Amino acid sequence: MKLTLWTYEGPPHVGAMRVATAMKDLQLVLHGPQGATYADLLFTMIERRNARPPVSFSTFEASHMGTAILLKDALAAAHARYKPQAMAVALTCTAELLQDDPNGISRALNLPVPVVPLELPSYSRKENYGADETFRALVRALAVPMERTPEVTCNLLGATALGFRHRDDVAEVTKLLATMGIKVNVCAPLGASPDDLRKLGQAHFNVLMYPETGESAARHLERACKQPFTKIVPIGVGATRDFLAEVSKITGLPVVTDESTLRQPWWSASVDSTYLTGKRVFIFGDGTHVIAAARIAAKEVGFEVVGMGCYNREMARPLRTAAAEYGLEALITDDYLEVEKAIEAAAPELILGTQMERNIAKKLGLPCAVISAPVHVQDFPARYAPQMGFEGANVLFDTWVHPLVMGLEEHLLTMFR
Amino acid sequence: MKLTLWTYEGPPHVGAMRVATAMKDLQLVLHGPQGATYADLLFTMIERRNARPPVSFSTFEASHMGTDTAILLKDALAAAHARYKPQAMAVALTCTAELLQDDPNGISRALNLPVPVVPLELPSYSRKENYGADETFRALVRALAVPMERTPEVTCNLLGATALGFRHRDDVAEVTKLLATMGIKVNVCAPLGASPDDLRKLGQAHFNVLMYPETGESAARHLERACKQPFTKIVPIGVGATRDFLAEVSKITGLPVVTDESTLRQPWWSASVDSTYLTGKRVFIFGDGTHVIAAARIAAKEVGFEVVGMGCYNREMARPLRTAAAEYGLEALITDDYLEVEKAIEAAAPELILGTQMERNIAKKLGLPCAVISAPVHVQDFPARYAPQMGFEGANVLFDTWVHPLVMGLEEHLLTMFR
Amino acid sequence: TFGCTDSPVRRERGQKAVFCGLTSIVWLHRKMQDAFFLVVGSRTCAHLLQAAAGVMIFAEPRFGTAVLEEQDLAGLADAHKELDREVAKLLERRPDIRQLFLVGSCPSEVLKLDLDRAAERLSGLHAPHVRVYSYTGSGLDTTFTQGEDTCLAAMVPTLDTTEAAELIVVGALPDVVEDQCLSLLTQLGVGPVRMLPARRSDIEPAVGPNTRFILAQPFLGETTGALERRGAKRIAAPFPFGEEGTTLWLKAVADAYGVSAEKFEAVTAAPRARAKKAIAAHLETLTGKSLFMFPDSQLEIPLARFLARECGMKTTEIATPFLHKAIMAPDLALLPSNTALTEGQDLEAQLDRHEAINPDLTVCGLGLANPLEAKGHATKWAIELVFTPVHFYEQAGDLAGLFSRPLRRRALLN
Amino acid sequence: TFGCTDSPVRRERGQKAVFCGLTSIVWLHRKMQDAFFLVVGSRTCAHLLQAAAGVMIFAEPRFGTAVLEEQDLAGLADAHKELDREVAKLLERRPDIRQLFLVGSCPSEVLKLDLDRAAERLSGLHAPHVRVYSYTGSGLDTTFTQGEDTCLAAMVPTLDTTEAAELIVVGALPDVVEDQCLSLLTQLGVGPVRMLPARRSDIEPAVGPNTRFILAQPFLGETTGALERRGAKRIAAPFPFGEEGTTLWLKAVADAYGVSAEKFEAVTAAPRARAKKAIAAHLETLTGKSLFMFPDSQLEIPLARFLARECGMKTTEIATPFLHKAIMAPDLALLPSNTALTEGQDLEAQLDRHEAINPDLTVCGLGLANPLEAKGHATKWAIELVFTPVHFYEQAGDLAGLFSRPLRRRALLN
Numbered sequence A: 001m002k003l004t005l006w007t008y009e010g011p012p013h014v015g016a017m018r019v020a021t022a023m024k025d026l027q028l029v030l031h032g033p034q035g036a037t038y039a040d041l042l043f044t045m046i047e048r049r050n051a052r053p054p055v056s057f058s059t060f061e062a063s064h065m066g067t068a069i070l071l072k073d074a075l076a077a078a079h080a081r082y083k084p085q086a087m088a089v090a091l092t093c094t095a096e097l098l099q100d101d102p103n104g105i106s107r108a109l110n111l112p113v114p115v116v117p118l119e120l121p122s123y124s125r126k127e128n129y130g131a132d133e134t135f136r137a138l139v140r141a142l143a144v145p146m147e148r149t150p151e152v153t154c155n156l157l158g159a160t161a162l163g164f165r166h167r168d169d170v171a172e173v174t175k176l177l178a179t180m181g182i183k184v185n186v187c188a189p190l191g192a193s194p195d196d197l198r199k200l201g202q203a204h205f206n207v208l209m210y211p212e213t214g215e216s217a218a219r220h221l222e223r224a225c226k227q228p229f230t231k232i233v234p235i236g237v238g239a240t241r242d243f244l245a246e247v248s249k250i251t252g253l254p255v256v257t258d259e260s261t262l263r264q265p266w267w268s269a270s271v272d273s274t275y276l277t278g279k280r281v282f283i284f285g286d287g288t289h290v291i292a293a294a295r296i297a298a299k300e301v302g303f304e305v306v307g308m309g310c311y312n313r314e315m316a317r318p319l320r321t322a323a324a325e326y327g328l329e330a331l332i333t334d335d336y337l338e339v340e341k342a343i344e345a346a347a348p349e350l351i352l353g354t355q356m357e358r359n360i361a362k363k364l365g366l367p368c369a370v371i372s373a374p375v376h377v378q379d380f381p382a383r384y385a386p387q388m389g390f391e392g393a394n395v396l397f398d399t400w401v402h403p404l405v406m407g408l409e410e411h412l413l414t415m416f417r
Numbered sequence B: 001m002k003l004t005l006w007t008y009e010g011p012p013h014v015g016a017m018r019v020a021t022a023m024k025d026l027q028l029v030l031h032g033p034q035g036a037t038y039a040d041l042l043f044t045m046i047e048r049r050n051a052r053p054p055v056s057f058s059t060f061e062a063s064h065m066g067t068d069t070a071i072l073l074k075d076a077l078a079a080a081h082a083r084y085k086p087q088a089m090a091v092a093l094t095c096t097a098e099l100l101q102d103d104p105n106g107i108s109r110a111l112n113l114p115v116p117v118v119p120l121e122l123p124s125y126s127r128k129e130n131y132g133a134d135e136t137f138r139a140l141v142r143a144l145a146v147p148m149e150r151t152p153e154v155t156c157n158l159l160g161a162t163a164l165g166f167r168h169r170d171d172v173a174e175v176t177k178l179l180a181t182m183g184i185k186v187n188v189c190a191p192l193g194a195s196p197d198d199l200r201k202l203g204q205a206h207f208n209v210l211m212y213p214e215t216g217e218s219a220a221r222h223l224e225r226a227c228k229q230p231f232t233k234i235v236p237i238g239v240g241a242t243r244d245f246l247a248e249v250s251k252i253t254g255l256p257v258v259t260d261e262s263t264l265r266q267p268w269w270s271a272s273v274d275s276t277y278l279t280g281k282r283v284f285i286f287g288d289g290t291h292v293i294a295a296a297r298i299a300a301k302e303v304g305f306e307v308v309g310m311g312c313y314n315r316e317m318a319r320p321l322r323t324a325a326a327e328y329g330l331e332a333l334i335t336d337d338y339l340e341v342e343k344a345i346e347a348a349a350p351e352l353i354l355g356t357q358m359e360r361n362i363a364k365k366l367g368l369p370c371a372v373i374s375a376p377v378h379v380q381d382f383p384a385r386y387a388p389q390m391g392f393e394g395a396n397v398l399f400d401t402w403v404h405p406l407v408m409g410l411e412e413h414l415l416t417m418f419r
Numbered sequence C, D: 001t002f003g004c005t006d007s008p009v010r011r012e013r014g015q016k017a018v019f020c021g022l023t024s025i026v027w028l029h030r031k032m033q034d035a036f037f038l039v040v041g042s043r044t045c046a047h048l049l050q051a052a053a054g055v056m057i058f059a060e061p062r063f064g065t066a067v068l069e070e071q072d073l074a075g076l077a078d079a080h081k082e083l084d085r086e087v088a089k090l091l092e093r094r095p096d097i098r099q100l101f102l103v104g105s106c107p108s109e110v111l112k113l114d115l116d117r118a119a120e121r122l123s124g125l126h127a128p129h130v131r132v133y134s135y136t137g138s139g140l141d142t143t144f145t146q147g148e149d150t151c152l153a154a155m156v157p158t159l160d161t162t163e164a165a166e167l168i169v170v171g172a173l174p175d176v177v178e179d180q181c182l183s184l185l186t187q188l189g190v191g192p193v194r195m196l197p198a199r200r201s202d203i204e205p206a207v208g209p210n211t212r213f214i215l216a217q218p219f220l221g222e223t224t225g226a227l228e229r230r231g232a233k234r235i236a237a238p239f240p241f242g243e244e245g246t247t248l249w250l251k252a253v254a255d256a257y258g259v260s261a262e263k264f265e266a267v268t269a270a271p272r273a274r275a276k277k278a279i280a281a282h283l284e285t286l287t288g289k290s291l292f293m294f295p296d297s298q299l300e301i302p303l304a305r306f307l308a309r310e311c312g313m314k315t316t317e318i319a320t321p322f323l324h325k326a327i328m329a330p331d332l333a334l335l336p337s338n339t340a341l342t343e344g345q346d347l348e349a350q351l352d353r354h355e356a357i358n359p360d361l362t363v364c365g366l367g368l369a370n371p372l373e374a375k376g377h378a379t380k381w382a383i384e385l386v387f388t389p390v391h392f393y394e395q396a397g398d399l400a401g402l403f404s405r406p407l408r409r410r411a412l413l414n
Ligand code: SF4
Pocket: A033, A034, A035, A036, A094, C020, C021, C022, C041, C042, C044, C045, C046, C048, C104, C105, C106, C107, C137, C138, C139, C140
């Protein structure tokens, strides 16, 4: 038992939901208690969706302890009602403690579409694992070896529902691949139907956009479909360049860039940015966004990276490898009190992190920007707001620098009283 | 004379520079004192430019009070030509040189150079920056726009985008898109991006999009009389006004309205349940005529705020604004004195204020939420990221910008209330 | 055309979209300044609290979750020793807390942790400074506001005994509401009167065979039971929403205390006229509009009653997650007799009913609200009605405002 | 290898890119708490103060501008009546102000408004509470920091007479710097010592034939003149930048006051060792780098002296808007002999020399900074050196930091 107030990540079943809601024509059925539907809210409210997530719960209660029957009707009702191309079934943390076997129950029922069962270790793993696993499982269950499309094409892998800037990152990466002759085959799970998943095999290679929600499924595709997948995530001008280089090697195609709107390199080089130099930054968040943020901070903006860490166990190796290159020991924790402590010890001048760090930042009168989930409604915006590629860099620059000029502004203004 | 701390607008010559810097292959020469170069900084720093503005000053001083001064502007004009070989030049006076004897007209005709030299009249004790811009652009246009044969393709001109324009760069980008989405291609865009040669080619466009009334109207009219070119009366800021703009273009060209709405999220966002408490919220709106009019329609008709005040610092837009504000049961506030604004806001007293870097401060003083909708503005509002106000991404961008300070206000309220 | 005492109520069971009682901790811990609510449960529970608490989570709130790890499952163990260590760690870094709540979850119940034995031993180890109780807030046994009910009911047995005839107003209300309530009752000459729960642990009420209590919230079945079990007697009354609700509520109390209609109409006419005028502003957009209410809180029947009778709305299907026949009787008596009444629910079934009915306003949870808007239906999210001051006279106009607003916005957006 | 007293200085006159004296009001009003600076000028003037004040404009600062309207040009009536009205308006709305400054602009001088006659009449009308002065800050007459010089020089004639031999440190410095300075001098045994300007109008220093002054800032030619005209005597010294500059500055004072080399080395060794350690941090990226300075402030020669001698920089062309031969003598003595010196400028001509020179570091105005960066040259904008504390011992390392930083950032960004 661990006293817990703040949690960076949900239970794994929310990760499952994140894959389901990301897709179309797929119904997720979760065995769980009356009350388990509370996650509904994250999708309809934070992501401001216009449809209930394609998720249904058996919703058992006290009187029901005496329930395998319930999951069966739940699976049945979802098919009858929505006639989806495919389904997935799994257990909530409460139903993890029950007897009922999702695998046995769904094969008993025998429906005219595939039903993928999922293992969700609700007492050992969290949201991201949930999403990686569900996505992986769905892919193993539908991806067939296939003939390569005549034109050069790739898959976008790992874009999910409550993804920090997934919507616009997908838009942005599609653009820069297209500026280089590559057309997108299918994007999964975001936007994909189970039928789209069956057509994955025919792409030449895979863009792994988000390691924590797509890696597993990218590997399966490497052995199962002879599909290589990109290791570099294009956040930051430099990392975007190398990503493009990486694609060149994979495809043989020459690197072609439309930089007519890339304003970050000049902005940062510009005279105004000279006092950014040496500014101490603390960086926290999810493995992927932290690694990218640190390269931008050191090699692109000129901050001193003074602290680096993440909440997701899964990225602890790539992060330690990376942090090492800055003379820094990675901080791996999901205890916001460990972060609060580390920030205080590092005493940065800017903090880059999550909604939580936003708050810590305010507690300590420090400027602050948000770089990764978990995040509130604000950071699911109406305006175009990628993190990847060139517009990504542009956007990043404005977001980070803004709270510094405000700080300088508040300081100076009160200093003239 | 009148005691002045804050000023919404520069002197007209700053407006001149806004036209010149917006252009390429055009040198402006301004007769003015040593010290007049201070506006250089505005382009270099706020618009973060990578080249010094195409503007040179005669730079006279104390010891020069004598026949020397006419001679100085002569050298200035001469040196700029010799050195940059521009396609065309313009020449006018600083406020202090407006008090001197030297005539820009007579002196440049005396010099007689191989390219046109447009003289400008800048009433520096009666008019301000935007006037300066409108007049310089007008003048340049009169001097260069010839009647011409209409292009085979349907094309239009983008008129009024200048240098220290609030969101001009990305507005030009955005309007270009929605015209292209509808079969129309842009002929020339001026002042922003154009050379004096492009200005000669204005005549061949079918019609004119008047993006910013306060920096392009004059030139649009000239083009109506001189080129039989009609010009759009509606400025596309806000989903509704964008629609009407498109309707207006349909009328003018005959082409059907075609929209790519795949990225338009503002209507749903504000229809969305989380927007309900925006209903009835009192907004005060101030800034530049054009932006305030637009902002009011979005507030009332699109987001559901109650518009509780409207005004502008821009005397030129007084009529359009009184016309507009009347429809809201409101009396327009026309002033350039931030203290009148401060008083009006207080009497109003709104829950949100939409305005200018000054109103951001007044808002701060008053512990009120606030968003910037119009010039004058600082470095931060000349962003690296895509940030139009016009068209569909405009709406999207506007919605984020306005809602943000309200959710922060509620957030800081609630969490202080929790201790 | 008014009266629903004899109308058949649809007892529905199936897919349910509701919050668990754990949620109640959110408004509840605010009221009880001395208390801390420790949920023994999974990370799911932690997550829910977080989602449910939004901004509050950053305001060091006096609730937390003892998240069960892998080895707390694996039998035997000191589930109890683990719990104890965490509790000591908690009470130390937090000596302000005077009463501690072990709030049971689904996982904790399915694992059958004896939280009662835990509360017992812990009361021992931490007396006299801290008293520790136990109660279920799980999805298995509790819907949303029902978590308030189980909490208070757990406190009742342990309350001080007394023989004085006193009035207890039961149910956490906002402090402005609580005060207005307290004032009016003093003006009517009923006294002395105390709330359950009280603002601090040291001024909890006493109960005895001569105690009278009246409910401010519909969802207090269990608490009623435990109070009656101690000898206390309820004043039946409809719930104080609107002018009519409040007057009828107050009157029920006055009558039980023998207050002349003299003093009653004196104390009450000013506040009443104020209340009725505030409501009229909304009568405009409200009258004639058909209403649908999904089950969330047990507040739906009396609020449907307020909306029909005082705002001229027409009821449709009004659903509650639980319907106490006796407590709700006053309000059922004044609800329009056409009303299709539902206890529990089967989501997809009820949505088909909804689609068919096509109502002008729908009350529902956040998970339903936007999807419904998207498909054309104006909604009003239920959860606002537990945090906004809505009870009694001064908040009556504000109450009706909660429902006019969405219709006015739907109207205004086109 | 060091010595520039004999070097031909290029007196250039052509297009100039510099700020006018009005700018000086921006740092200057901060140091004189009692004072208000009223500029009589055009909107152009107002706009420049605005641009030059950036954020400060919103901090209710104690300067403004009586902006000339059309009627004020048009002949001699009420320019003075109108000015008077605005001053009365101003002094009532702001009764804390004890000194008011009519600051002259280009427009006001071309119009020949007699700001002097105005100051005198207004001193009359607002005595005893307010004394009003007049001085020019116009582009026609002053470059940037030269506005401080004209201001101070206007105050001098009116200063109280005294016969005590006192030290006056001339030039607005940061309060941090001013105190460090004041302390060291008291520790050397020099006293009593006062600043011009003083923090408040009531503690302005007195002047007499027995007064000694030393300059803290190079741009004080006029104030020197007016101070001497009253009988005071200047201590010549180089300007207190770097360890060398400060030491030599302090030495000059000590010498004039006959303080033993024992007492001097005692007070001075600690802060000196501290100073030269702080500068070593920067010696790394600084040594061997060529320096170019465009004309802005008159601080460029002594700063060039500090950069070359203490940080191992190589000078190139060092330009100043004005070069007082006698004041700048100590520092010219220490500048490396190769240095091409310029007074005034022709922008295009100087820029050709710049391009030709290809310097590692270029000091310049904001209007040139970015364009030069774009073209590949590392730059350090000049205007920071009037707001940031840079003088004396503790600020020395910081000073070197201002120049090292851009080079390390150009390095770092590739
Ligand atoms: S429904 Fe049960 S398992 Fe889920 S959050 Fe509520 S108490 Fe915890």
